[PDB]
Amino acid sequence: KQVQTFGKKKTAIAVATVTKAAQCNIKVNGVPLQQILPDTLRAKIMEAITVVGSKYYSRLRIDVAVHGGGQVSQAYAARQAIAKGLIAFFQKYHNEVEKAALKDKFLAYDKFLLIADPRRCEPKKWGRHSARTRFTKSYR
Amino acid sequence: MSSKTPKLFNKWSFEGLETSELALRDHISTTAAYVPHTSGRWQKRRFYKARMPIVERLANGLMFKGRGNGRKLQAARLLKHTLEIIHLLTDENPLQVVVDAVSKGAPREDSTRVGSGGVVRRQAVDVSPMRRVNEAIYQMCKGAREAAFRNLKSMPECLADEIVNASKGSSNSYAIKKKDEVERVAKANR
Amino acid sequence: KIRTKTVKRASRQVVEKYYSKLNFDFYQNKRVVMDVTIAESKKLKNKIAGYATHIMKRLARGPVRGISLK
Amino acid sequence: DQAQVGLIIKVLGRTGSRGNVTQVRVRLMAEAGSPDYNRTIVRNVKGPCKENDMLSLMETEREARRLK
Amino acid sequence: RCCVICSNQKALIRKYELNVCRQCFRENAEHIGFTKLR
Amino acid sequence: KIHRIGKRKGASLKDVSAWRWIKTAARHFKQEGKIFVPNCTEIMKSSHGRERAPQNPDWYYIRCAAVLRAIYLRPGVGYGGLSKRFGNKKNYGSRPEHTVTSSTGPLHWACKSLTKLGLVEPGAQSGQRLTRKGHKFADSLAFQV
Amino acid sequence: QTVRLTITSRNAKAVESVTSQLLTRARDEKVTIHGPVRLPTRTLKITTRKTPCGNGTNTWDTFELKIYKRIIDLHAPTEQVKKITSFTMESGVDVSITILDR
RNA sequence: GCUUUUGGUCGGUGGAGUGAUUUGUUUGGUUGAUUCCGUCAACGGACGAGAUCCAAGCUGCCCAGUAGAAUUCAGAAUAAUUCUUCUCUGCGGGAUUCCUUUGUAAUUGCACAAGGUGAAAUUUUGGGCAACAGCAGGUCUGUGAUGCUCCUCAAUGUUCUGGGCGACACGCGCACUACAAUGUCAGUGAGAACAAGAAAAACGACAACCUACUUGAUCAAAAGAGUGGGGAAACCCCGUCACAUAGACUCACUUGGGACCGAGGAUUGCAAUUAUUGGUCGCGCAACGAGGAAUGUCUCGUAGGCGCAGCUCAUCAAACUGUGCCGAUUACGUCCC
């Protein structure tokens, strides 16, 4: 009774571990959902649980391994690992219908997980400063 | 709905909302959201800007003039304080006030150079729906940095003070004063 | 989006020389390309396979330059 | 009140030197049992516009670009 | 730090990875196995 | 079913509840000179007051979660912009200095030593009251104050 | 003596042209071999201004390498490895390997 | 380097012209494209474009003892097992204008759009490359790369040659950069989290590179010293931010400039008379308080903000080269400049 899954944003990697129980609450990358410090990320990382099925669906014991990004991209890395993590189960341990209900309710929500929304910083180039910004002219 | 569909700023009411003005009504964001900070490819395309909650749009448009700025998360803090001050000033859903504060802010009509090749010439030109959206939020929060620059005894209130007023239509708001003074440059020229 | 004369030309040699490629499927009409054609790159076949299906489909509309042995 | 809310029927074209304003044919938005259309009065809009835009006109019944 | 191909001790020479090729430039001196990509 | 941090939000809590327990208990150790700045490039006086009073349980919750560390690794928790820096770009560096003395405190008093972390780990138990006993008007439930 | 192989060479079809091919001298023969994958690739990146002179459009080169490491693992044949590596002649710039551990 | 960011250039035979020259290389439609189709006194060919390349994104196969997860068993606080989700990489899949829209345009065509599928949706993305003609463009300070013709021994040669300069104070005029004056971190004191490309070493001798640990610590800081493995998959705690921690400021040139400043002291090393600095701590009362005309460069993980290594390097980054974090409003346009 398990699956496993991975979140990704930019470089940030979340990995969703999966264990089963119906009473339980999730740690942050290392620390429980409730207590993650920037409120304004929490209610986001609530969205995985709260939005769509809040309670009727998943209390499952879940831990996440998040490395490779700064703080916020690690909050987006996370939730995806959950929505991915959750959708994994109802394919393995449940019927298409219970799945089809959930992932639709995601699809309407946004690309909560359709994908990492792949965007990586542009390589700095030439004498160009940072990227696309040029060393500035004078006496032009 | 047991906090499933419905949304909360932290705990707040996004359902009863609509815009008043049939002009820009029915395209402006009517919120279902929690936090104004979301990340997606916000405007890949041409008119995509009208989808996402003004709450973002403000929080997004929230802090120009970057110097050591944290933007979205620093913004959302300020909007925790901003909305709360506002509703229990105005006794309304500040989701309404802000929604009601967008419309009265921007000029419905403008005067541009249509002059050809260095000639400065006039025409009355008629503003477009996304420009009352856009310029409102832009100038709306421009009143902040001004009212907020030095003389403040007022930490967040500046933002509260030009959202409150505009939602009242008052001419004191740096928001609306340009809605009229542009139209002294509009109906005058035409 | 616009195809170079190289895509254009070679794809006219295929349709001239292969009626194995029939279905409007880009995917079927592709897998017949790469075995039969060596362009040394994928995009060429991906281009070629895209235009090769334009030709066939349009043949059903009427005649097309490089007319068939029919 | 002054709000008379019309539709863009179409973008009658780009107009003007910079790329900014755009000629538009406006269908007065208000509908009444005696439907008052213009039917159409050409307008110039400031900023980006699109196929179904609601354009409330504060200075109504002006005949637009004509001259220049 | 006079360097490898010439008297130089100028045209400041790369220490990077201790190959000292700048004397006759790492452009003229090549076959090192470097390539021009990106 | 209670672990170090992890149940707590030890940000300003699992420290501070340990702090009073460190200060009010006469047991622990505060060396003499406090007049000197703890922290990277700070001309501000080392704090308003209570200088070691932020310091010690860091080193403990530094020990606990990060297992093995030291003088070199633990200042990774001591943070600074290193910005006094004069008309140049600022840069960033940590403090090796009070480290040794800081960790000597735990070299006494029931917390393991010249290699590891702790002995009995009071931290859980002495911290086991946080969800029980709140400072801030901790909400908990209507049963617990 | 489980032995170890580190093949470090740049050039195209060397790092491959030994380990892939030339371990099947041991791979399919009396030896029993433990293949892992090649370690990660490196690039050695120098960038020098293109101008011998001062004048420029401020332009720079970027020159690169790739060094390709492969680890390939064994049980212990005695004296066979001396025969193993020596079976197969084909490559250049590729690396011979003498390793013991555990 | 630049003309030169664009899409341009050249020839053979043929045609027109006494000829220089011209046609091919075009009206029109479309495209970033002399890119296409159509038309065509031109026909068939060469370059440039494209395409090959390189990195980034989703993905297959192989693979892990110099990658890291699952589980049971026992132990503190209420060590055995199997694997490839995560990482490694060579070679492969994938993208194409593919359906749809009676759409725009249009009997053809070449195509465009809004939409669909998908990690990616229109040269997918960022680059490298790049014709033909030229420029009295820069380099004789890169080079046994070179023509002259000056020097040739109290030398314009050479000196681990000695000392000095290249860097000086008329607030002089100018280019680029770093600092910043706020109550939007705002200043600072603590506290919580988390990142990535990159480097690391010595021979004609009997270790000179980094970094982790813990002493220096009964008394500053930076220092000193001893132990420990790394030839590189020895390392992962970077600041921005998060903090209401009930912290301190508090209608001000100021609990914000760090300049100028004289006293000690640690450090690299032939020598520092400011080399330099989490080094102290005095000067703050030096400007300074959104910047006159004028001027810069870019459109999506982008500007901006932040910061980290690398390169020079015995010592020193406000420089450049590259990596990553935070992450924007405006146009999806015109030719007016």
Residue numbers in the entry:
A (entry chain AK): 10 to 149
B (entry chain AN): 1 to 190
C (entry chain AL): 3 to 72
D (entry chain AZ): 20 to 87
E (entry chain 8): 20 to 57
F (entry chain AO): 19 to 163
G (entry chain AQ): 15 to 116
What does the paper say about this structure?
Here, we have used cryoEM to reconstruct the ribosome structures of L. donovani and Homo sapiens at 2.9 Å and 3.6 Å, respectively, and derive their atomic models.
Our best 3D structure was obtained with global refinement and has an averaged resolution of 2.9 Å. The entire ribosome appears in a conformation resembling an intersubunit-rotated state, with a discernible E-site transfer RNA (tRNA). Our structure reveals that three of these rRNA ends are not involved in helical base pairing, which is energetically unfavourable in the absence of other stabilizing interactions. This problem is resolved by two new trypanosome-unique extensions in proteins uL13 and eL33 that bind these three cleaved rRNA ends and provide extra stabilization to a fourth rRNA end. We hereby name this extension as uL13-pin. uL13-pin is rich in basic amino acids and pins down three RNA molecules—srRNA2, srRNA3 and LSU-β –through electrostatic, hydrogen-bond and π-stacking interactions. In the structure formed by srRNA2 and LSU-α, ES42L of LSU-α is unusually large and meets srRNA2 to form a ‘kissing–helix' interaction through canonical base pairing. Nearby, protein eL28 fashions a trypanosome-unique C-terminal extension, which is rich in basic residues and rests in a groove in ES42L, stabilizing the structure.
